[PDB]
């Protein structure tokens, strides 16, 4: 039974670290614009 | 010009000739029985070559009048579905004669007579097109298998196995017979072609379908009544244990594919979810039950139940994939279960244990049998390249065309099937030997090493190139699935 | 293996080391070569290779199908 | 070979130590040469003539 | 006897068949069923032919496969929409 | 060639074979038999029937009665 | 390698059948011929029968009719 | 020529296993090595004819299942991704066969080992060259079976039997996942062939009814394929079989538990690149699980004291980074890591096996001490392997192990920063244990017994040439392959990979990344090396052996027992199912209630009803 709590606790560390990544908001701090490609961003190629 | 009637008559001639000769000349009896079985097998193969797979109508038909009005008569005939069952039942009988070849002096001429009568009767079941007379031959196998189980069976519980086997095929059989009579009185004839093209009442198909399923849910090991197979199969002789799981379990499925799916199409749709639940719970429950077994026979008898239940999932999923995979897995099981039960029989006929814990670590002593057993339990796993995989995956594909829940449980069946199959393999062939009760024991002699060679070649031929088998049936399966489905 | 010398051991016993294995090895190589010749013949018979090579490869010495699939309309 | 007070070890083979030493030397040389050529490229000291 | 060749079958739809009362005429039922299944298999083989065509496309197409085989993709998918006895989409023939 | 078949095995083998004499409808085991005999079949039956119903809902066809 | 070895004959007996004395046949079993001839006939009839039979089916017929019909 | 590569191992194993008596204990081994060596030679020929001479060859033998548009065939797919995997698998198999002639020379069952590995090599060649799912599934289940067989090589080992059975359990869970994925492909595209799904995988955008809710097909299929590959790729779902599967022979743990089957799922997901690409939801869980495993294995592998077990966790960490590199839509970097790893990790296991063979199988780092000059060649071999494992700068390890983290930072999402953090952190633990292996063994005052020291017996010629070849590989293969697989737009993946224009962080990564991050893995590796030196050679009185009472020794048990997950999973699933397989069914079903009110339990009233009608 003691070993069970480690699995929940260990996964709790990861979701807790996963929650930290959510709070950090890495997505919106890009130093670059979205990529631009010729021919309407390759519309005929897609 | 080889017709269907000669195939039926060959076992009859072999049995009648065998009764003429006395019992003192035992060599003549066994020789003539094996010769008759083998020539019947060759005749069955010849019938395969001259089989038109393009047309949808039935092949060779022989009509022998039964009632004075020609109302109902013996209407023999094969199609894409019935041909392979005929080939399999002609192939299994010589194996049955060959396994007990050493003990023929102990059994006698009744043994071969019973087996040839079984071959005749089982051939007559699969290749006939009269619904009523098919019922007559359908439970006509009661007498010969009752004799086989009872006369040469267990020590003292042989009586109870015969009674349970005989009792389970009475109430459902006659409750089916009532529906047979209602169909006969309503339409007028029991000819299959006539009965297919009939407008049944919407409320009537429910009762008739239930009555048919009641007598097929006992032959196919469904959830309510499947406990007969383990007990009546352990308490059975090895040659009687190789056709009980090789042919009899096909009667229910074949009967579903002949007189249940076509005649009652919308009843099949209305009863589809119920069959799915029954088959899924059967698969799961049997899988969990079989992994804590110590009887050397039931351990694979439950595997047979699981495979037969998985068959119905795609058999009742109206689809070309589902039904084709159904018959392919049916033939694959008819081979693999037969091979497994022959392996159990040879293991039992040396040591006479009927347990699992006694055997252990015999790979250093019987390497040939070890390899053969590994290949058979490997086919039971449903490896691609083996017989079971193509059919069983086709069943999964066909059911997933219709439904997305139940056959996922069917696939979950194999997440434990393979596990306990290899675990069972590792009980016996692995570990250190225990020469405290295994003093002397030998390996397969020339007979039982050659007996598996047809099994090996048929298994690999199923696995690597099943196109020839699918070629002859795609017309019949497609005709079956589209019947009464105008749009 | 006191008793293990009595079993057939299809792939070889505990420590077989037969008296003449080198000749069996040589005949085994000869048989493998003889049986893989038809495999090579079949492989050279069926190989599409839709695109022509940029440089001459050790192929097209026994394979004659090169650039035979740039006609993807008459396909069955 | 020889024993100290009860433990004796076979002399390492000549064809093993020599190859080990030489191959270690040649991989060290390759590492140092790669450092000389493209060392500034991966450390940002200088770009591979692309700007 | 045999024609020792392809099994020629009548392309003409059988006569005497009425969708409102199919079960009235039993003798015409089986050939209509055979004709329907044969036509379904014709559609299946047409879909397989389109699949083979796109099969041979993808090898020659290269990186930019979308550009010059997009027209055949729709042709293959519309065939797969009315396929035989498949998923919940049952064709109405 | 027949095994020794020591006495301390057949008793347990028959106990596994003859377990039919040990059943007295105990309440905990009665709930255990009832749940796996009825509820799980009912739950799975609802699963398949609702899977069919949701499949038919998207296509827009009316639901089959499925008695 | 360079040494030839030992164990003049591989251990064990094939099929557990003891080898007969030199100059005598194997004394074929009473079912040996009837079943070997059965196997031989089955192998040959499957080899020459399943291949010399016409390739008539619904796959090839549908193939031909799909090729002929797709052109219009 | 091209059919030969896959059938030489199969035919050689078949003849060497059916007639192993004829060829003996050495002829079978040498002939299997010969067959696999020529298979590798034709693999190199195919690589030249396909990779450099870019023209994929396609050949079809005969339909396998000719049913209603389920035309699975025996056709073969030879693209750039196939050949680069072949030149790895067959080359490593041939060198392992050479290594095993001398390693498996004192053992009795020599031919059976050779035939097992040769049929396995045939199965994996069928996997790699397979044109459709069913053939790929065939090879995949075959390689799973053969892995089980090799774990079960010594049948008499009770522990090995259980380990093989558990490996079969997890592999069968993977079989469930991958079979469901494969069939789900057919219900959507009405095909299983690679060239049809890839050609038309973008058109459908419908949602299915998959048994609980409405889910998008492509996302569901990708998730199902991941659930299939978790067992094979050893991901977070089920990867407890690697450390427990080291009970088998070293060469198979050297050959296969480190090179290709562990990356078989990686190769499978890379092969179906234009199917995972259209489901951005899937790539999230791919990256999440990759980071999860790369952290789990690195953390669990730091306190292990077993020679053959500690490196399995390193292999699991490598699998984690490979999965992460797959989830970034940069599978070219993932396969680059694959080819780099297949050299040095196999080199590390082969050197460890050479050491363990000479020291009479004493795989406990508590024992071996300083006898490096006794084994200089193997020391150099494993030094090269471990330095490539570290990602030593300007070696075959640096060209992938740093680039993967660099690409990890350059993508900006929620899970991206998480995965980058885990990948950066795992470097410390990985370097720590990979250097503790070299410290506690051959670099500390000796603790091994005199009976093992006196044996000596340096590795002979047979198991030293493959070591030399792998050493010369994992020193220049990375440099010779960095330009020609990932050259910022090379023409090496015309049809093997589909690179999405949007998820294409390759050009912007090399230039917009800061210089500081491009060197921080080196600093982490040096810090790990210094920590290992401190705890293993200078400060080991308290940093190595702590006599703590509570809250600190439980930490020692936590990492050593692998977070106790090998016990929780057993007791909570396997034990539960083992108990409830009989407890409910065999007691309250089958014989029982269906019997007491059935045939003869209490419905046999006639016996009690017999003596009432004769009144
Ligand atoms: C659906 C099947 C698909 C194909 C699967 C093929 C996979 C191979 C299947 C057989 C694997 C071998 C397992 C045999 C049982 C293992 C234990 C055993 O009994 O081994 C035997 C035989 O050993 C063998 O493994 C030989 C069997 C052949 C193995 C090689 C198989 C090659 C052919 C199959 C693959 C061909 C290519 C694919 C075909 C299309 C004896 O071993 P010994 O070394 O002699 O030990 C001696 C015993 N004692 C110590 C007590 C004295
Ligand atoms: C220990 C010694 C064993 C020796 C065995 C032979 C040695 C080889 C061992 C390898 C195993 C071979 C097993 C057979 C594999 C056949 C694979 C190819 C079959 C195939 O697809 O081609 C078919 C050939 O039919 C045929 O002719 C196949 C004939 C095979 C006969 C096998 C007899 C098995 C009998 C078992 C009965 C079980 C009954 C169960 C229902 C027709 O192909 P197609 O469609 O293109 O037509 C052609 C029209 N031009």
**Contacts (Cβ under 8 Å, ≥6 apart) of H198:** E58, E65, H272, H274, H275, H498
Q: Are strands H72-73 and B63-65 parallel, antiparallel or unpaired?
A: unpaired
Integer Cα distance of B123 and B243 in angstroms: 13
Distance from CA of H564 to the nearest CA of A (A): 6
User: Which of B143, B109, B95 has its CA nearest to residue B17?
Assistant: B109
3-state secondary structure H417-441: HHHHHHHHHHHHHHHHHHHHHHHHC
CA distance H509 to H513: 6
Q: Which ligand is closest to the CA of C2, given by its number?
A: 1
Any idea what DSSP says for residue E22?
A: G
DSSP code at position C65: -
Please tell me the distance from the alpha carbon of residue B480 to that of residue E37, in angstroms, as a whole number. 10
- d(CA B129, CA H492) in angstroms, rounded, equals 63
**DSSP of F16-63:** HHTGGG-----HHHHHHHHIIIIIHHHHHHHHHHHHHHHHHHHHTPPP
Q: HSE on the CB side for B182, CA within 13 Å? A: 16
Residues in Cβ contact with C34 at an 8 Å cutoff, skipping those fewer than 6 apart: none
Strand, coil or helix: what is B320? helix
Please classify residue D1 by burial: count the beta carbons closer than 10 Å to its beta carbon, then call 0-12 exposed, 13-18 middle and 19+ buried: exposed
Q: Taking each helix axis from N to C terminus, what angle separates B406-428 and B272-290, rounded to the nearest 10 degrees?
A: 20
Alpha-carbon span H573 to H503, nearest angstrom? 39
B200 Cβ closer than 6 Å to some ligand 2 atom: no
E53 contacts on C by Cβ (under 8 Å) = 72-73, 75
Residue with tokens 């070649």, as numbered in its chain: B457
CA distance B472 to B462: 14
Three-state secondary-structure class, residue H65: strand
Kind of pairing between the strands at H76-78 and B73-75: unpaired
Dihedral sign, CA of C62, C64, C70, C74? negative
CA pair distance B125, B136, nearest whole angstrom = 9
Q: Which residue has the tokens 């009764």?
A: B19
Which 8-state DSSP code applies to residue D13?
A: P
* DSSP classification of residue B295: B
| Distance (Å) from the alpha carbon of C33 to chain G's nearest alpha carbon | 22
**Separation CA G39–CA H472 (nearest Å):** 56
Cα(H253)–Cα(H289) distance, integer angstroms? 24
Residue G32 is encoded by which pair of tokens? Answer: 């040996």
Task: Enter the tokens of residue B179.
Answer: 């529906």
Contacts for H160-167: CB closer than 8 Å, 24+ residues apart:
H160/H247, H160/H248, H161/B426, H161/B430, H161/B431, H163/H241, H163/H244, H163/H245, H163/H247, H163/H248, H164/B426, H164/H245, H164/H248, H165/B419, H165/B422, H165/B423, H165/B426, H166/H240, H166/H241, H166/H244, H167/H241, H167/H244, H167/H245
Nearest CA to ligand 1 atom 34: H14
Q: Which chain B residue shows the shortest CA-CA distance from G53?
A: B49
Question: Where do we find the tokens 């978790």?
Answer: H230
Using CB atoms, pick whichever of E51, E57, E63 lies closest to residue H69.
E51
Within its chain, how far is the Cα of H41 from the centroid? 25
CB contact under 8 A, E53 and C75: yes
The SS3 assignment for H258 reads coil
CA B13 – CA H386 distance, rounded (Å):
78
Cα H57 from Cα C30, distance rounded (Å): 29
Residue B203 CB: number of other CB atoms within 10 A? 8
Calculate Rg over the CA atoms of chain E.
Answer: 19
Distance from C-alpha of F19 to C-alpha of H583, rounded to nearest angstrom:
12
Q: How far apart are CA B202 and CA B198, in angstroms?
A: 12
Instruction: End-to-end CA distance of chain C: give it in Å, rounded.
Output: 61
Q: How far is H563 from H544, CA to CA, in rounded Å?
A: 20
Nearest of F4, C4, F8 to residue B436 by alpha carbon: F4
d(CA E76, CA E74): 5
What resolution does the deposited structure have, in angstroms?
Answer: 3.7
DSSP for residue G14: G
C-alpha distances in Å from residue E44, one per residue of B57, E37, E89, H70? 22, 10, 15, 11
Give the residue from B485, B484, B477 showing the smallest Cα distance to B197: B484
Beta bridge partners of residue B65, listed in sequence order = B73
How far apart are the CA of G11 and the nearest CA of chain C, in angstroms? Answer: 5
State phi, psi for B75 to the nearest 5 degrees: -115, 85
Q: How many CA atoms lie within 13 A of D21 on its CB side?
A: 8
E43, E84 in Cβ contact below 8 A? yes
Q: In the numeric block, which tokens belong to residue E60?
A: 């020659």
Give residues with Cβ within 8 angstroms of B260, minimum separation 6. Answer: B209, B212, B213, B216, B268
Check: CB of residue B121 under 8 Å from CB of residue B139: no
Crossing angle for the helix pair B80-99 and B467-482, to the nearest 10 degrees: 130
Q: How far apart are CA E90 and CA E83, in angstroms?
A: 8
Q: Which residues of chain C are at the H interface, by a Cβ-Cβ cutoff of 8 Å? A: 9-18, 21-22, 24-25, 28-29, 31-32, 35-36, 39-40, 42-44, 46-55, 57-59, 62-63
Question: For chain G, how far is it from start to end, CA to CA, in angstroms?
Answer: 72
Q: Which residue in G61, G63, G66 is closest to E7 by CB distance?
A: G61
**Is the CB of residue B378 less than 8 Å from the CB of residue B447?**
no
How far apart, in whole angstroms, are the C-alpha atoms of residue B23 and residue B111?
12
B204 class by beta-carbon count within 10 Å (0-12 exposed, 13-18 middle, 19+ buried): middle
Note whether C8 contacts B367, CB cutoff 8 Å.
yes
CA-CA distance, F19 to F34, in Å (whole number)? 19
Asked whether B175 and B215 are in contact (CB, 8 A), the reply is yes
Phi, psi of D2 (to 5 degrees): -125, 160
Interior angle at CA H502, CA H501 and CA H504, nearest 5: 70
C-alpha span between B264 and G8 (Å, rounded): 71
Q: Does A28 touch chain H (CB under 8 A)?
A: yes
- CA torsion angle for B251, B254, B259, B263 (degrees, to 10)? 150
With beta carbons less than 8 A apart as the criterion, state whether E25 and E17 touch.
yes
Helix (H, G, I), strand (E, B), or coil: what is residue D3?
A: strand
**DSSP run (H or E) holding B265:** helix B265-270
Helix (H, G, I), strand (E, B) or coil at E18: coil
**Test the H interface: residue of G10, G51, G60 with most H CBs within 10 Å:** G10
Distance CA C7, CA B420 (A): 29
CB of E25 within 8 A of CB of B198?
A: no
Element (H, E) at H215: strand H215-216
Q: How far is the CA of B96 from the centre of ligand 2 (A)?
A: 23
Are residues H173 and H221 in contact, defined by beta-carbon separation less than 8 angstroms?
no
B482 touches chain E (CB under 8 A): yes
In the block, residue with structure tokens 């031909």? G64
List all residues 6 or more positions away from B330 whose beta carbon is below 8 Å from its beta carbon.
B250, B253, B311, B391
CA distance H312 to B336: 38
> What is the C-alpha to C-alpha distance for residues B341 and B297, in angstroms, rounded to an integer?
8
Nearest-CA residue for atom 14 of ligand 2: B461
Structural contact between residues B431 and B361, judged by C-beta atoms closer than 8 angstroms? yes
Interface test with C, best of E47, E49, E60 (most C CBs within 10 A): E60
**Phi-psi domain of B230 (left: phi exceeds 0; alpha: psi -120 through 50; beta: other):** alpha
With contact defined as beta carbons under 8 Å apart, do H155 and B361 qualify?
Answer: yes
Q: Please tell me whether residue C73 adopts helix, strand or coil conformation.
A: coil
Q: How far apart are CA B451 and CA B432, in angstroms?
A: 29
> What is the Rg, in whole angstroms, of the alpha carbon atoms belonging to chain G?
27
Residues in chain B closer than 8 A to F55 (CB atoms): 403-404
Distance (Å) from the alpha carbon of H298 to chain C's nearest alpha carbon: 41
Q: Which of H380, H387, H473 to mutate to test the interface with D (most CBs of D within 10 A)?
A: H380
d(CA H82, CA H273): 13
**Which residue's structure tokens are 């692998």?**
H562
Is the separation of the CB atoms in B361 and B434 below 8 Å? yes
Burial of B401 (0-12, 13-18, 19+ CB in 10 A): buried
Question: Using alpha carbons only, what angle is made at residue H217 by residues H214 and H221, rounded to the nearest 5 degrees?
Answer: 120
List the one residue out of H256, H269, H375, H412 whose CA is nearest residue H331: H269
* The two structure tokens encoding residue E48: 């397989």
| H-helix segments, H158-248 | 158-189, 194-199, 217-233, 241-244
Sign of CA dihedral H545, H548, H552, H553: positive
If we measure between CA atoms, which residue out of H545, H553, H558, H551 comes closest to residue H300?
H558
Rounded-to-integer distance, Cα H50 and Cα H45, Å: 9
Q: Measuring CA to CA, which residue among H216, H411, H248 is closest to residue H324?
A: H411
Experimental method, per PDB record: cryo-EM
As to burial, measured by CB atoms within 10 angstroms (0-12 exposed, 13-18 middle, 19+ buried), residue E27 is exposed
- Two tokens, residue B418: 């393979």
- Joined tokens for residue D32: 């140092």
Q: Are H397 and H430 in contact, with CB atoms under 8 Å apart?
A: no
Rg of chain C's alpha carbons, rounded to an integer?
23
CA distance B306 to B285: 9
Query: Two tokens at B250?
Result: 């096909």
Instruction: Find chain H residues with C-beta within 8 A of F43's C-beta.
Output: none
**DSSP calls for H434-502:** HHHHHHHTTSS---S-HHHHTT-----STTTHHHHHHHHHHHHHHHHHHHHHSSSS-SS-TTT----SS
| Whole-number Å distance between alpha carbons of B230 and B156 | 17
Instruction: Return the bridge partners of H216, or none.
Output: H207
Query: Does residue H12 contact residue H32 with C-beta atoms inside 8 Å?
Result: yes
Q: Any bridge partners for residue H470, and if so which?
A: none
**Cα–Cα distance measured from residue B5 to residue A40, given in angstroms and rounded to the nearest whole number:** 75
Q: Which of H430, H441, H302, H429 is nearest to H365 (CA)?
A: H441
Distance of alpha carbon H615 from alpha carbon H612, whole angstroms:
6
Q: Tell me H373's DSSP state.
A: G
Q: Which ligand is nearest to the CA of H16?
A: 1
C-alpha to C-alpha distance for H521 and H526, rounded to whole angstroms: 9
How many residues are present in chain C? 76
| Token pair recorded at residue B429 | 């062939």
Total residue length of chain B? 487
CB H148 within 8 A of CB H137: no
DSSP string, H319-366: HHHHHHHHHTT-HHHHHHHHHHHHHHHHHHHHHHHHHHHHTTS---TT
Q: What span, in angstroms and rounded, lies between the C-alpha atoms of H476 and H484?
A: 13
Cα separation, H73 vs B315, whole angstroms: 25
- DSSP symbol at B68: T
Confirm or reject: Cβ of B460 under 6 Å from ligand 2: yes
First-to-last C-alpha distance (Å) of chain B: 41
User: How far apart, in whole angstroms, are the C-alpha atoms of residue B354 and residue B230?
Assistant: 13
Residues 6+ apart with CB under 8 A from E46: E79, G66, G69, G70
Per DSSP, the three-state class of E20 is coil
CA atoms lying within 13 Å on the CB side of residue H118: 32
In sign, the C-alpha dihedral spanning H122, H128, H131, H134 is positive
- A43: buried, middle or exposed (CB in 10 Å: 19+, 13-18, 0-12)? exposed
CB–CB of H66/B321 below 8 Å?
A: no
Say if residues H341 and H260 touch (Cβ distance below 8 Å). Answer: no
SS3 label, residue H255: helix
Residue owning tokens 């606790």: A9
Reduce the secondary structure of H90-145 to three states and give it as a string.
HHHHHHHHHHHHHHCCCCCCHHHHHHHHHHHHHHHHHHHHECEHHHHHHHHHHHHH
Q: Which of B87, B455, B457 to mutate to test the pocket of ligand 2 (most atoms within 8 A of CB)?
A: B457
């Amino acid at each position: 039974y003691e070993a069970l709590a480690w699995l929940s606790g260990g996964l709790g560390f990861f979701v807790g670290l996963g929650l930290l990544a959510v709070l950090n908001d890495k997505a919106s701090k890009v130093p670059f614009t979205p990529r631009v490609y010729p021919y309407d961003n390759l519309r005929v190629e897609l | 010009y080889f017709n269907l009637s000669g195939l039926i008559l060959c076992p009859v001639l072999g049995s009648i000739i065998l009764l003429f000769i006395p019992n003192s000349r035992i060599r003549l009896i066994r020789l003539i029985g094996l010769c008759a079985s083998l020539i019947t097998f060759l005749y069955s193969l010849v019938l395969w070559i001259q089989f038109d797979s393009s047309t949808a109508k039935f092949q060779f038909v022989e009509s022998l009048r039964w009632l004075p009005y020609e109302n109902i008569n013996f209407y023999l005939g094969i199609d894409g579905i019935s041909l392979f069952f005929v080939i399999l039942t002609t192939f299994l009988i010589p194996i049955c004669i060959l396994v007990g070849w050493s003990g023929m002096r102990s059994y006698g001429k009744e043994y071969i007579i019973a087996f040839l009568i079984c071959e005749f009767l089982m051939i007559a079941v699969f290749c006939m097109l009269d619904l009523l007379l098919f019922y007559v031959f359908f439970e006509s196998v009661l007498i010969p298998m009752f004799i086989i189980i009872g006369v040469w069976g267990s020590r003292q519980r042989k009586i109870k196995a015969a009674y349970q086997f005989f009792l389970y095929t009475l109430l459902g059989s006659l409750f089916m017979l009532l529906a047979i009579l209602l169909i006969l009185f309503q339409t007028g004839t029991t000819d299959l072609q006539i009965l297919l093209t009939t407008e049944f009442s919407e409320r009537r198909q429910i009762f008739l379908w239930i009555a048919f399923f009641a007598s097929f849910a006992v032959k196919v090991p469904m959830v309510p009544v499947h406990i007969w197979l383990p007990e009546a199969h352990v308490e059975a002789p090895t040659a009687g244990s190789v056709i009980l799981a090789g042919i009899l379990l096909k009667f229910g499925t074949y009967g579903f594919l002949r007189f249940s799916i076509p005649m009652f199409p919308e009843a099949t749709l209305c009863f589809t979810p119920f069959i799915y639940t029954l088959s899924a719970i059967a698969i799961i429950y049997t899988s969990l039950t079989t992994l804590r077994q110590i009887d050397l026979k039931k351990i694979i008898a439950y595997s047979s139940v699981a495979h037969m239940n998985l068959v119905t999932i795609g058999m009742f999923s109206l689809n070309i994939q589902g039904i084709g995979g159904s018959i392919l897995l049916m033939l694959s099981h008819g081979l693999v279960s037969s091979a497994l039960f022959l392996c159990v029989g040879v293991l039992y006929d040396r040591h006479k244990t009927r347990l699992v814990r006694y055997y252990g670590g015999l790979v250093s002593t019987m390497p040939n049998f070890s390899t053969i057993f590994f290949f058979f339990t490997l086919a039971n796993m449903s490896l691609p390249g083996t017989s079971s995989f193509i059919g069983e995956f086709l069943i999964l594909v066909g059911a997933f065309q219709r439904n997305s829940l139940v056959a996922t449980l069917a696939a979950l069946g194999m997440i434990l099937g393979a596990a306990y199959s290899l675990w069972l393999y590792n009980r016996v062939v692995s570990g250190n030997l225990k020469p405290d009760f295994l003093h002397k024991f030998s390996d397969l002699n020339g007979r039982e090493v050659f007996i598996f060679i047809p099994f090996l070649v048929g298994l690999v031929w199923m696995g690597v190139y099943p196109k020839v088998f699918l070629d002859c049936m795609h017309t019949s399966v497609s005709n079956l699935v589209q019947h009464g489905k105008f749009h | 293996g006191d008793f293990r010398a009595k079993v057939w051991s299809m792939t070889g016993g505990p420590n077989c080391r037969p008296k003449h294995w080198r000749r069996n090895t040589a005949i085994a190589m000869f048989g493998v070569f003889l049986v893989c010749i038809p495999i090579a013949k079949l492989s050279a018979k069926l190989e599409q290779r839709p695109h022509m090579p940029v440089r001459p490869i050790p192929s097209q010495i026994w394979c004659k199908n090169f650039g035979t699939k740039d006609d993807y309309e008459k396909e069955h | 070979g020889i024993t100290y007070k009860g433990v004796t070890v076979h002399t390492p083979k000549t064809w093993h130590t020599v190859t080990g030493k030489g191959l270690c030397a040649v991989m060290w040389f390759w590492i140092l040469y790669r450092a000389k050529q493209d060392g500034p490229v991966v450390m940002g000291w200088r770009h591979p003539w692309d700007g | 006897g045999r024609k020792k060749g392809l099994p020629e079958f009548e392309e003409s739809a059988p006569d005497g068949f009425d969708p409102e009362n199919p079960y009235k005429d039993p003798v015409a039922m089986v050939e209509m069923r055979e004709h329907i299944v044969r036509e379904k298999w014709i559609q299946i083989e047409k879909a397989k032919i389109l699949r083979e065509k796109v099969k041979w496309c993808y090898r020659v197409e290269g990186v930019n496969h979308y550009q010059k085989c997009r027209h055949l993709v729709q042709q293959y998918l519309d065939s797969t929409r009315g396929v035989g006895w498949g998923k919940d989409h049952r064709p109405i023939s | 060639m027949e095994t020794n078949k020591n006495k301390f095995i057949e008793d347990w083998g028959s106990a596994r074979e003859n377990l039919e004499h040990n059943f007295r409808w105990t309440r905990r085991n009665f709930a255990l038999i009832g749940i796996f005999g009825i509820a799980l079949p009912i739950i799975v039956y609802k699963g398949i029937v609702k899977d069919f119903h949701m499949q038919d809902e998207d296509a827009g066809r009316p639901h089959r009665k499925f008695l | 390698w360079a040494t030839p070895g030992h164990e003049e004959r591989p251990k064990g007996y094939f099929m557990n059948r003891t080898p007969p004395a030199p100059g005598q046949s194997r004394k074929w079993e009473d079912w040996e011929l009837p079943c070997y001839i059965t196997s031989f006939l089955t192998i040959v009839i499957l080899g020459v029968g399943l291949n010399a039979k016409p390739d008539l089916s619904i796959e090839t017929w549908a193939h031909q009719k799909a090729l002929e019909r797709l052109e219009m | 020529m091209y059919l030969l590569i896959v059938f030489l191992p199969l035919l050689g194993s078949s003849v060497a296993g059916f007639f192993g008596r004829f060829l003996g204990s050495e002829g079978s081994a040498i002939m299997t090595t010969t067959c696999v060596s020529f298979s590798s030679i034709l693999s190199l020929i195919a690589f030249y004819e396909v990779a450099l001479g870019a023209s994929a060859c396609y050949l079809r033998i005969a339909p396998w299942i000719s049913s209603e548009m389920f035309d699975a065939s025996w056709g073969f797919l030879f693209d750039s991704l196939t050949v680069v995997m072949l030149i790895v698998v067959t080359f490593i198999s041939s060198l392992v066969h050479l290594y095993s002639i001398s390693y498996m020379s004192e053992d009795p069952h020599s031919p059976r080992f050779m035939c097992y590995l040769s049929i396995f090599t045939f199965f994996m060649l069928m996997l790699v060259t397979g044109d459709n799912f069913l053939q790929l599934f065939l090879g995949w289940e075959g390689v799973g079976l053969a892995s089980y067989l090799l774990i079960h090589f010594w049948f008499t080992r009770l522990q090995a039997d259980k380990a093989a059975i558990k490996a079969m359990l997890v592999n069968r869970v993977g079989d469930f996942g991958l079979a469901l994925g494969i069939l789900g492909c057919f219900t959507l595209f009405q095909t299983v062939d690679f060239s049809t799904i890839f050609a038309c995988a973008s058109v459908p955008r419908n949602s299915w009814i998959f048994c609980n809710m409405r889910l998008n097909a492509i996302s569901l299929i990708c998730i199902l394929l991941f659930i299939g590959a978790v067992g094979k790729s050893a991901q977070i779902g089920l990867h407890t079989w690697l450390p427990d599967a080291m009970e088998g022979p070293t060469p198979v743990s050297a050959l296969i538990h480190a090179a290709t089957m562990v990356t078989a799922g990686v190769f499978m997901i890379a092969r179906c690149s234009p199917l995972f690409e259209y489901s951005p939801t899937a790539l999230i869980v791919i990256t999440f699980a990759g980071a999860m495993t790369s952290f789990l294995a690195a953390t669990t592998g730091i306190l292990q004291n077993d020679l053959k077990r500690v490196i399995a966790y390193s292999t699991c960490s490598q699998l984690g980074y490979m999965i992460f590199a797959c989830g970034i839509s940069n599978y070219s970097v993932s396969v680059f890591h694959l080819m780099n790893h297949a050299f040095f990790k196999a080199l590390l296991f082969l050197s460890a096996g050479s050491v363990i063979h000479a020291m009479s199988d004493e795989q406990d780092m508590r024992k071996m001490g300083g006898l490096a000059s006794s084994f200089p060649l193997t020391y150099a071999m494993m030094l090269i392997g471990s330095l490539s494992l570290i990602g030593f700068p300007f070696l075959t390890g640096f060209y992938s192990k740093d680039v993967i983290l660099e690409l990890a930072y350059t993508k900006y999402t929620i899970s991206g920063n998480f995965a980058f953090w885990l990948g950066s952190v795992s470097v410390l633990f990985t370097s720590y244990y990979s250097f503790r292996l070299l410290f506690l063994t051959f670099l500390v005052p000796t603790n091994s017994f005199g009976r093992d020291i006196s044996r000596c017996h340096d590795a002979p010629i047979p198991m030293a040439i493959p070591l030399i070849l792998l050493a010369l590989g994992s020193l220049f293969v990375g440099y010779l392959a960095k330009d020609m697989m990932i050259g910022l737009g090379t023409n090496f993946w015309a049809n093997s990979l589909l690179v999405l224009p949007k998820n294409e962080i390759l050009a912007e990564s090399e230039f917009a990344a800061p210089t500081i991050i491009k060197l921080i893995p080196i600093l982490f590796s040096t810090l790990g090396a210094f920590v290992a030196y401190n705890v293993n050679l200078v400060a080991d009185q308290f940093q190595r052996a702590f006599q703590t009472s509570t809250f600190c020794n439980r930490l020692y048990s936590f990492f050593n027992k692998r977070w106790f997950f090998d016990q929780v999973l057993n007791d909570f699933l396997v034990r539960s199912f083992l108990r409830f397989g009989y407890e409910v069914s065999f007691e309250a079903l089958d014989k029982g209630a269906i019997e007491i009110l059935g045939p003869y339990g209490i419905s046999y009233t006639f016996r009690r009803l017999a003596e009432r009608i004769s009144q």
